[PDB]
């Protein structure tokens, strides 16, 4: 920019989207990467592998395609994150993938967060992923209990549109139940 | 196809240049060889450019030199039309000369030594301290210039 | 330089990490009964005594660390390569 000798960062660096140092450490495993990403409204899980001209996504799941199996609830929460990982995981198993290393990109390793929920979801799908149980939120929170109790402090329904008043972590169970089942159309 | 004649001796010439001549089958002064115009052969003559005389000879001249200096791969058997006809894929010297100049075959392929051991130039040559453009005998020659030299060394 | 008197590290005896105490190696006393001692008495006489007439060599500007590492749980010590150090003081 300034002149001939000026050093411009790699593109994914300028864009502030890829931590190259963490990436290298990630790739050193030789295993595929369970790419966990999150939007204000959605959550995405991808099983990525290395390739000649760029990465190769072998399987994936977005929180959107969750409704596809009976989800009328929001998609930017814990239950969403877990189930999304499980779906991506299941599909991963389908394509032949058996193991992965969690790549949370620029997100923080906060204990109990959604990137970790995505990981517990993918693990339950049967994927072998180096992890740490005491960094994962406890089952109930994954179910979405924390939000139920929040709707308990009602006076005004937590959700605008009506999916339910006091919400339902039991719906989480139905969907998970539906996924762990074979029939499912991955 | 170019005709190559060594005109400068080996003493004091770079070894890699002397080896190049040997790879081109010339091991003595006045010895001549016929080389195909290929990129590979082109680098070789360019490297030996200052110790040799080269160029494309005329059909007639080639025929004169073949009749007078061509030799069998082994033996002293003289090479004439009959030899050519009874030993090569051609009818007479002319047919061989044409095939060589058109780069369809080589002296070796036809059972002939790759080298024509010429005689010193009758009337002497133009000198080995300067190139053709300067009046000397070194370097690339005219079809006519090359013919003049080869004939004087028939 | 500073050196902690105790710290956790590998004990080649227990074969696992345990607390060790570091000590500078104190010179043990000689007995005067080793073969070399007898050879000096046997080979020294009238005149020069060869190797036995030679005197102590010099000193290097700085000496290497010379410590004992004693396992706080099995009581056994082990040695390690030393490193040049002008001075070596233990912390605590």
């Amino acid at each position: 920019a300034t002149g001939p000798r000026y050093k411009v960062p790699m593109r994914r660096r300028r864009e502030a989207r890829t931590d190259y140092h963490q990436r290298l450490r990630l790739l050193k495993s030789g295993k595929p990467r369970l790419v966990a990403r999150k939007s204000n409204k959605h959550v995405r899980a991808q099983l990525v592998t290395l390739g000649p001209n760029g990465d190769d996504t072998l399987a994936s799941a977005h929180s959107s395609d969750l409704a596809e199996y009976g989800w009328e609830a929001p998609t930017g929460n814990m239950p969403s994150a877990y189930l999304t990982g499980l779906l991506a995981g299941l599909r991963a198993q389908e394509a032949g993938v058996e193991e992965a290393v969690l790549d949370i990109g620029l997100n923080s390793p906060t204990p109990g967060s959604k990137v970790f929920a995505i990981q517990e979801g993918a693990i339950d799908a049967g994927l072998d992923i180096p992890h740490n149980d005491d960094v994962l939120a406890d089952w109930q929170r994954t179910r979405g209990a924390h939000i139920a109790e929040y709707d308990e402090q009602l006076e005004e329904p937590l959700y605008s549109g009506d999916f339910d008043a006091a919400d339902l972590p039991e719906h989480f169970d139905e969907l998970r139940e539906t996924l762990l089942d074979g029939d499912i159309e991955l | 196809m170019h005709a190559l004649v060594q005109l400068r001796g080996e003493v004091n010439m770079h070894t890699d240049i002397q080896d190049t001549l040997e790879m081109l089958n010339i091991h003595h002064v006045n010895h001549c060889t016929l080389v195909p115009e290929t990129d590979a052969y082109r680098g070789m003559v360019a490297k030996v450019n200052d110790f040799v005389a080269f160029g494309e000879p005329s059909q007639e001249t080639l025929e004169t030199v073949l009749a007078t200096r061509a030799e069998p791969l082994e033996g002293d058997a003289d090479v004439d039309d009959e030899w050519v006809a009874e030993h090569t894929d051609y009818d007479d010297i002319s047919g061989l000369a044409f095939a060589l100049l058109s780069e369809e075959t080589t002296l070796r392929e036809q059972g002939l030594s790759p080298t024509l051991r010429l005689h010193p130039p009758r009337g002497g040559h133009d000198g080995v301290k300067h190139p053709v453009k300067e009046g000397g005998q070194l370097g690339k020659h005219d079809t006519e210039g090359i013919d003049d030299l080869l004939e004087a060394m028939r | 330089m500073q050196m902690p008197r105790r710290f956790n590290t590998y004990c080649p005896h227990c074969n696992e990490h345990q607390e060790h105490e570091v000590e500078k190696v104190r010179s043990g006393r000689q007995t005067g009964m080793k073969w070399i001692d007898r050879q000096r008495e046997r080979n020294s006489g009238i005149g020069n005594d060869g190797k036995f007439s030679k005197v102590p060599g010099g000193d290097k500007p700085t000496k290497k660390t010379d410590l004992k590492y004693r396992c706080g749980e099995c009581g056994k010590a082990h040695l390690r390569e030393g490193w040049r150090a002008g001075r070596l003081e233990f912390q605590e």
């Binding site: 001939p4 000798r5 000026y6 050093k7 411009v8 960062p9 790699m10 190259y20 140092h21 990436r23 290298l24 790739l27 050193k28 290395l50 | - | -």
Partner: protein, 95 residues
């Protein structure tokens, strides 16, 4: 030379072209080569470890196995055969 250390006279060959300065892309540090593959040896100024002796920069050896993540590359120094331990970061496939 005035001294004989491993980095003697390596100013040029171990210095980055200004724009190639900074951490290098991870892709080539993770590349995988098969035994028998021809690979050019060239130390990457930005990568500290996994280097070979600078004197070998420019060689085009043959991968003949690996040791840990590093590769064992066969070369012929002058007339002597030598084996070089080197990581992908300092290697490039030939052709």
């Amino acid at each position: 030379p005035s001294s004989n250390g491993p980095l003697e006279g390596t100013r040029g060959k171990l210095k980055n072209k200004p724009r190639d300065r900074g951490t290098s892309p991870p892709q080539r540090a993770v590349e995988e080569f098969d035994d028998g593959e021809k690979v050019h040896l060239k130390i990457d100024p930005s990568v500290p470890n996994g280097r070979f002796h600078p004197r070998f920069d420019g060689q085009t050896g043959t991968v003949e196995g690996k040791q840990g993540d590093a590769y064992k590359v066969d070369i012929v120094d002058g007339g002597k055969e030598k084996t070089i331990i080197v990581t992908a970061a300092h290697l490039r496939r030939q052709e």
